[PDB]
């Protein structure tokens, strides 16, 4: 019998000739690989609990290609749908782990590369915005930005990309993949940019949703037959705040929740 090293599943997406259908198909496939056999609470799938999750089920891979015919593979943690690192050619790069258990988990990613690197910084938006020199509100998203971001990640091993541009490229990828997988609303925002072949920065309603995912997951899972103990404040597109008191309002907005 032959013994093979273990593999994590790969989902493909290309910006080359991307359409509303190809992007929607990609996000649906990512969600499907995140939620196999998952628990569902108030119609919303819950991602696996990090505690007790076997290492051979901890990650999924997103292989991104572009019109330049380059390929980079991002690793997503299935417990929060977030990017933990990427591979380009014969090199892999990882955000600084938050703890020693997560540091051990990432050693199982990209076990065919000859060069492995860990950034001293983590991958949260605050830090990446600092390195990029721009907030999310001033970084345009769309197929154009993603096309360029894939090239920038690829060329980081060759010296053609410096860290600020790399951080900007992560901000683009994370929002167009991780946040779109988490939120039907952000999926639609990205699909509309593709539909019109335009790029534009995310408005305050998108940013606040991103910042609120953990708290929304908590409120839903702690609710009393769908009613929140305390209302959650979100933002409209014009920046004004509004309150949400019930899971039923979040059902069209959210697609996945972190385990609580």
């Amino acid at each position, epitope marked *: 019998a032959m013994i093979f090293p273990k593999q994590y599943p790969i989902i493909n997406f290309t910006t080359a000739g991307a359409t509303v259908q190809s992007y929607t198909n990609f996000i649906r496939a990512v969600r499907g690989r995140l939620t196999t056999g998952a628990d569902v609470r108030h*119609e919303i799938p819950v991602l696996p609990n990090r505690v007790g999750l076997p290492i051979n089920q901890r990650f999924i891979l997103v292989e991104l290609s572009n019109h330049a015919e380059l390929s980079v593979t991002l690793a997503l943690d299935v417990t929060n749908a977030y990017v933990v690192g990427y591979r380009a050619g014969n090199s892999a790069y990882f955000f600084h782990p938050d703890n020693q258990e997560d540091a051990e988990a990432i050693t199982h990613l990209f076990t065919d590369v000859q060069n492995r690197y860990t950034f001293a910084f983590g991958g949260n938006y605050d830090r990446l915005e600092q390195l990029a020199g721009n907030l999310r509100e001033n970084i345009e998203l769309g197929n154009g930005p993603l096309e360029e971001a894939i090239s920038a990640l690829y060329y980081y091993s060759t010296g053609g990309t410096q860290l600020p541009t790399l951080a900007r490229s992560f901000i683009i990828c994370i929002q167009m993949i991780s946040e779109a997988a988490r939120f*039907q*609303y952000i999926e*639609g925002e990205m*699909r509309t940019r593709i539909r019109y072949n335009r790029r534009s920065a995310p408005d305050p309603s998108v940013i606040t949703l991103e910042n609120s995912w953990g708290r929304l997951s908590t409120a839903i899972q702690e609710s009393n037959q769908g009613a929140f103990a305390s209302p959650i404040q979100l933002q409209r597109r014009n920046g004004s705040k*509004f309150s949400v008191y019930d899971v*039923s309002i979040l*059902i069209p907005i959210i697609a996945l929740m972190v385990y609580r």
Partner: nanobody, 124 residues
């Protein structure tokens, strides 16, 4: 772009049923769809909504249980099944399209495309 056209309205007695259709041309194209209604001299009000790729639904309290919204991508149609109709349901019903739906999907001002409406009348 997208163009929307409603059909399926009519006159029914209390307890009757109607199935409204919101047909998108050339294609529904993963747009979310919201249904609204307006009676003479009253404000428009959102009734129900459905998202474009997961078919997640929302209903105003006044129509929960009685009304069911569903999406048929193959027919490029979103349906609103209206059961146990009441006189108070009399109105012109409109469908509207947005991608994504507004965060509160009864916010009609944020939708981008509207149909011309279909009349629903329930006898007293």
């Amino acid at each position: 772009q997208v163009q929307l056209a409603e059909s399926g309205g009519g006159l029914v007695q209390p307890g009757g049923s109607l199935r409204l259709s919101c047909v998108a041309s050339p294609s529904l194209d993963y747009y979310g769809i919201g249904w609204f209604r307006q009676a003479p001299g009253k404000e428009r009000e959102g009734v129900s909504c459905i998202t474009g790729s997961e078919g997640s639904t929302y209903y105003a309290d006044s129509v929960k249980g009685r009304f069911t919204i569903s999406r048929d991508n193959a027919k490029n149609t979103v349906f609103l099944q209206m059961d146990s109709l009441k006189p108070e349901d009399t109105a012109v019903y409109y469908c509207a399209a947005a991608d994504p739906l507004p965060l509160v999907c009864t916010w009609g001002d944020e939708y981008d495309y509207w149909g011309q409406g279909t009349q629903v009348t329930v006898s007293s």
